[PDB]
Amino acid sequence: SNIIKQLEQEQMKQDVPSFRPGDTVEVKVWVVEGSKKRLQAFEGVVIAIRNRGLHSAFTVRKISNGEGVERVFQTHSPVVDSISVKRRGAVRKAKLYYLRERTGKAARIKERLN
RNA sequence: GUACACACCGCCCGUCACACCAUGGGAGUGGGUUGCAAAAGAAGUAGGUAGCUUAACCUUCGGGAGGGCGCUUACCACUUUG
Numbered sequence A: 001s002n003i004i005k006q007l008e009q010e011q012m013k014q015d016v017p018s019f020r021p022g023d024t025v026e027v028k029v030w031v032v033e034g035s036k037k038r039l040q041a042f043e044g045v046v047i048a049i050r051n052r053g054l055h056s057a058f059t060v061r062k063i064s065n066g067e068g069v070e071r072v073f074q075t076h077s078p079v080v081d082s083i084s085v086k087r088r089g090a091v092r093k094a095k096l097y098y099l100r101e102r103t104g105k106a107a108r109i110k111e112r113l114n
Numbered sequence B: 001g002u003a004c005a006c007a008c009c010g011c012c013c014g015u016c017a018c019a020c021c022a023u024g025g026g027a028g029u030g031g032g033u034u035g036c037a038a039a040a041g042a043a044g045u046a047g048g049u050a051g052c053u054u055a056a057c058c059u060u061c062g063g064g065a066g067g068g069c070g071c072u073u074a075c076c077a078c079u080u081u082g
């Protein structure tokens, strides 16, 4: 497994911040429109994390312009320019799929004080 | 006696056929308004308060009081369902 380990290690990002399910994060991703390249933000609740080395991913949910949207980011992709935690959430579960059935007041997540 | 008056060779009724018009019913179906039973909860105001932060007052100079932010509850507009 050392050959593939070396291949994966040379590609991993070194500056991924720590975040947990239930946190609010802002993800800045590259967008190409013609010749221009710019950063677009996507901010929402982390509802799932897949810890898998170079194949790590995380899922962010938001309500956007009257519509719920989920994005599954590949953590080490160069498309993802940056990740930052905006608010720390207090949940028990690793996977918050129950939030898909909730809106407004029913979907609130308590802040994690630490 | 009369409903006749170009005066019984008068007057006149209804179905049927034709034309037009408005209207009742009608499998139902589309709008408007509205009742009831719920869902919902922006902003504001009021109550509470883990957490964060404080120009005037009081300090035994460490702080205290009080305030603010944030969070939370109540009321409620949009909106949704039957």
Ligand SMILES: [K+]
Residues within 6 Å of the ligand: none
């Ligand atoms: K007479």
Ligand SMILES: [K+]
Residues within 6 Å of the ligand: none
């Ligand atoms: K006739």
Ligand SMILES: [K+]
Residues within 6 Å of the ligand: none
């Ligand atoms: K008719």
Ligand SMILES: [K+]
Residues within 6 Å of the ligand: none
């Ligand atoms: K307050």
Ligand SMILES: [Mg+2]
Residues within 6 Å of the ligand: B008
């Ligand atoms: Mg005759």
Ligand SMILES: [Mg+2]
Residues within 6 Å of the ligand: none
């Ligand atoms: Mg009719």
Ligand SMILES: [Mg+2]
Residues within 6 Å of the ligand: none
């Ligand atoms: Mg209510």
Ligand SMILES: [Mg+2]
Residues within 6 Å of the ligand: none
């Ligand atoms: Mg409110």
